[PDB]
């Protein structure tokens, strides 16, 4: 049975997610419009840049994150941002569609669309397969937000100083998640192990995105299509 | 009577302008959409960033520009780009409207719209007054493109090394323009002097834009709305 403290953590993570995932997708009309080889890059760079702002907002409300040093906060967001975006995008992904549905018809994204932004199928094929594997787990929203927080608060990320402080934060969240699944998720005996495997999947996806981003960022006619916030977060400065 | 060499200069400048001013304005649908205090900044930053690319294309076809060193080319574009954009925008400005009409209704710009991108009336009131004063001159297209080239090739700009080389280029263009007006422009005895005064007007406008841009660029929630190419060209690096 979960304690009040463990329950307060769940409450605060759910509220944080609800404050920064917009189910109406109303901001997408603000992006440079989609065009359907690099024709989707303006739209999808704007989309990812927007999502980064949402991940930053979410992170700032994870209990303990804001007390870390500014350097550790930056280090955790720079290495985990693409992973959190992939994770949080599962709530618009559909097994029936194999697509991300974000409101209107202009903002439904195939595999055909997302291969038109400078990235190839060696990133996009594992990403789609990760989405369906994750969707099939049928996570409660409590499990979904806990996984995002655990992913964000991984101490084995380049640039973090206070390893022990953030590992302590992560272990607390892991404890919450294991107890949640045991008490509240019928048939979830194997679920925690599968969720941890998805964290490994994300590391692999992160590596492939980072390798391919280096190609874009070295071609100035492509990098000039990105946003300042994307250049900062996926850039190599320390 | 104009020589063949002076005539070849006019031909090449007109062709250069026709290659990089798109009378159909078809690319404007690619920008982040207008929103009608900072609500026009995404759209107008995209608009200005697009215009910078066009000015670079124009500059690369001015006889003599491409033979300057890469540093001098960068120095001339960084100090003159905003002036060339203000100048070239006169071909969509209307005395009847006091607006810039760029194709469809979403891309007609009032004084009300262009005050919604972080800049105030101490830039926008002189800019509009400059537009009507320029429009009233009824420049031939030959005079218009020559003025843009002369403005671009001003040696009294910060960062230029080869002053004497680019002053020589500018004097040639000035000679062309004075002879053009005398032979081909009826009643143009006072025109060259007025065009030179507009170059002074642009310096003042440049100074005010640069001062106000510093405000935007120091507020990261605003500068993050700009494009990488805008940050490069209006930035302070040497």
């Amino acid at each position: 049975m979960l304690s009040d403290e463990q329950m307060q953590i769940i409450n605060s993570l759910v509220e944080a997610h609800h404050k920064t995932y917009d189910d109406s997708y109303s901001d997408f009309v603000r992006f440079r419009p989609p065009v359907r080889r690099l024709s989707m890059l303006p739209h999808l760079a704007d989309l990812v840049s927007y999502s980064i702002q949402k991940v930053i907002g979410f992170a700032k409300m994870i209990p303990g994150f804001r007390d870390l040093t500014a350097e550790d906060q930056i280090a955790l967001l720079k290495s985990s941002a693409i992973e959190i975006i992939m994770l949080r995008s599962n709530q618009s992904f559909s097994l029936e569609d194999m697509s991300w549905s974000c409101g209107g018809p202009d903002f439904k994204y195939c595999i055909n669309d997302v291969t038109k932004a400078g990235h190839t199928l060696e990133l996009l094929e594992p990403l789609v397969k990760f989405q369906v594997g994750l969707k099939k787990l049928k996570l409660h929203e409590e499990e979904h937000v806990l996984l995002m927080a655990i992913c964000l608060l991984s101490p084995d990320r380049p640039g973090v100083q206070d390893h022990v402080r953030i590992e302590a934060l992560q272990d607390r969240l892991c404890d919450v998640l294991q107890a949640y699944i045991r008490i509240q998720h019928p048939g979830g005996r194997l679920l925690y192990a599968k969720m941890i495997q998805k964290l490994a999947d994300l590391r692999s996806l992160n590596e492939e995105h980072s390798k391919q981003y280096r190609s874009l960022s070295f071609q100035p006619e492509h990098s000039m299509q990105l946003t300042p916030l994307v250049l900062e977060v996926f850039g190599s400065e320390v | 009577m104009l020589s063949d060499e002076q005539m070849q200069i006019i031909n090449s400048l007109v062709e250069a302008h026709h290659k990089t001013y798109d009378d159909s304005y078809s690319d404007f649908v690619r920008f982040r959409p207008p929103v009608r205090r900072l609500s026009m900044l995404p759209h107008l930053a995209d608009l200005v960033s697009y215009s910078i690319q066009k000015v670079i294309g124009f500059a690369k076809m001015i006889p003599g520009f491409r033979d300057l060193t890469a540093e001098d080319q960068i120095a001339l574009l960084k100090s003159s780009a905003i002036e060339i954009i203000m100048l070239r925008s006169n071909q969509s400005f209307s005395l009847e409207d006091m607006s810039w009409s760029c194709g469809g209704p979403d891309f007609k710009y009032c004084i009300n719209d262009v005050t919604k991108a972080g800049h105030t009336l101490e830039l926008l009131e002189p800019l509009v007054k400059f537009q009507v004063g320029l429009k009233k001159l009824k420049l031939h297209e030959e005079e218009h493109v020559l003025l843009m080239a002369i403005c671009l090739l001003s040696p009294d700009r910060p960062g230029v090394q080869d002053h004497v080389r680019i002053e020589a280029l500018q004097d040639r263009l000035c000679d062309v323009l004075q002879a053009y007006i005398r032979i081909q422009h009826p009643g143009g005895r006072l025109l060259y002097a007025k065009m030179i005064q507009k170059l002074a007007d642009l310096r003042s406008l440049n100074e005010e834009h640069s001062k106000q841009y510093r405000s935007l660029s120091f507020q990261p929630e605003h500068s993050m709305q700009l494009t990488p190419l805008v940050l490069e060209v209006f930035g302070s690096e040497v």
Partner: peptide, 10 residues
């Protein structure tokens, strides 16, 4: 260094 990130983190 990381001007926008710092601002967004408050």
């Amino acid at each position: 260094r990381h001007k926008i990130l710092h601002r967004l983190l408050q």
